[PDB]
Amino acid sequence: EIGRTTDPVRMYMREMGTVELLTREGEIDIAKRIEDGINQVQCSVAEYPEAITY
DNA sequence: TCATTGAGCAAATGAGCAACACTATTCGCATATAATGGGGTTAGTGACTCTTAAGT
């Protein structure tokens, strides 16, 4: 638990122990979600007319 | 008539600036098989005091 620890890298390794490792397939899905957000922000800035004149 | 004082002046040298042109430094950026949880103390202190905490 959160005891008497004083090394900050030990607390960093505790606070990074909550997440899990990535499998063979999952990071392609995460990168697809990243590219989906990039495509969404591009397709929402697309139809702005003053950006087209810029 | 000439030495002495009061004032200044052209010229030579030292310092430096202003704008521009070339160039040696320096920094932002990119590496695509896979790589997925760390070392390193202090070890035969002593005595005393202050605070916190279980025990009564």
Write a structural description.
Belongs to the sigma-70 factor family. RpoD/SigA subfamily. It is found in: Cytoplasm. It comes from Escherichia coli (strain K12). This is RNA polymerase sigma factor RpoD. The PDB classes it as gene regulation. The entry lists the keywords RNA polymerase, DNA Binding, transcription, Q-dependent antitermination, Q antiterminator factor, gene regulation. This protein has 54 residues and is mainly alpha-helical. The protein has three helices and no strands. The chain is elongated. 59% of the residues lie in helices and 0% in strands. The structure holds one DNA strand of 56 nucleotides.
Instruction: Report the portion of residues in β strands.
Output: under 5%
Q: Work out the helix count.
A: 3
Overall spatial form = elongated
Helix percent band: 55-70%
Largest sheet: none
What's the helix-strand series? HHH
Helix/strand structural class: mainly alpha
**How many beta-strand elements?**
0
Work out the radius of gyration: 21 Å
First-residue to last-residue Cα separation: 55 Å
